[PDB]
Write a protein that binds this ligand. Structure first.
Ligand SMILES: *Sc1ncccc1C(=N)N
Ligand SMILES: [Mn+2]
Ligand SMILES: [Mn+2]
Lengths: 137, 137
């Protein structure tokens, strides 16, 4: 049986700027760095940054909707989002926000998100505002 | 302050085979489905499948190393790998690093992994045999 994401690995084109983004700007904990990668944690998440000569800096209109959302409390959400905006972090556009969410890009164009709320909370909210054709199991 | 991974969203080209893969083959719990997506869970992981016409079925040689690893116990690893092999699921890499890993592709070419071992286990292995240029913090 599968239980949990073991780790998320992001391919990066330039290791140092990516480490700086996740550690300095997003506040994740850096545990180790080497010539071709780094290991960070964000709560229980194990994040690997892997230096990959294949990774391209990708504009958001050129990538699909695959994305990675990080949890933040309702009390911290707005000021963290505003800090990213003031720092000039690039954003990506959607037709609709997933509740209380802020959408932004990493240095290589990985699609990231800050979101307030759990899956249970989202399911409860969606019961009142369902997607088209939504069924709940 | 960020407190963990809130959710992983995968863009999919066809919803039905992706739901079959994640729910039936990989055993994740399906909580809701709508005309253009689904919500599943795998342990603490909130997985969203989002139908996206911009998703390309992507050969592994044409995507970078970004990948998503799921946790499984050592005792369960071999029979799960054999299940994937029986189902004809393609492998994109052989394991050459500490802790059991099976590297497999989803129907759209998303790069997945089964892994046994925590960040702590990896860091302990690395402190015994540090990678080239490795620094700890
Ligand atoms: S699923 C849902 N829940 C809450 C608010 C909006 C939506 C929606 N886009 N249908
Ligand atoms: Mn999202
Ligand atoms: Mn991995």
């Amino acid at each position: 049986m599968l239980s949990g994401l073991n780790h998320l690995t992001l391919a990066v084109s330039q290791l140092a700027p990516s480490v700086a983004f996740y550690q300095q700007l997003l506040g994740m904990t850096l545990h180790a760095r080497w010539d071709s990668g780094a290991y960070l944690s964000c709560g229980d998440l194990w994040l690997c940054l892997s230096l990959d000569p294949q990774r391209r800096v990708t504009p958001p209109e050129e990538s699909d909707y695959t994305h990675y959302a990080f949890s933040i409390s309702e009390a911290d959400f707005a000021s963290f989002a505003a800090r990213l905006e003031a720092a000039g972090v690039a954003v990506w556009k959607l037709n609709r926000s997933e509740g209380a969410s802020h959408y932004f890009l990493d240095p290589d164009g990985h699609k990231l998100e800050l979101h307030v709320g759990s899956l249970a909370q989202r399911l409860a909210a969606c019961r009142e505002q369902p997607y088209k054709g939504m069924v709940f199991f």
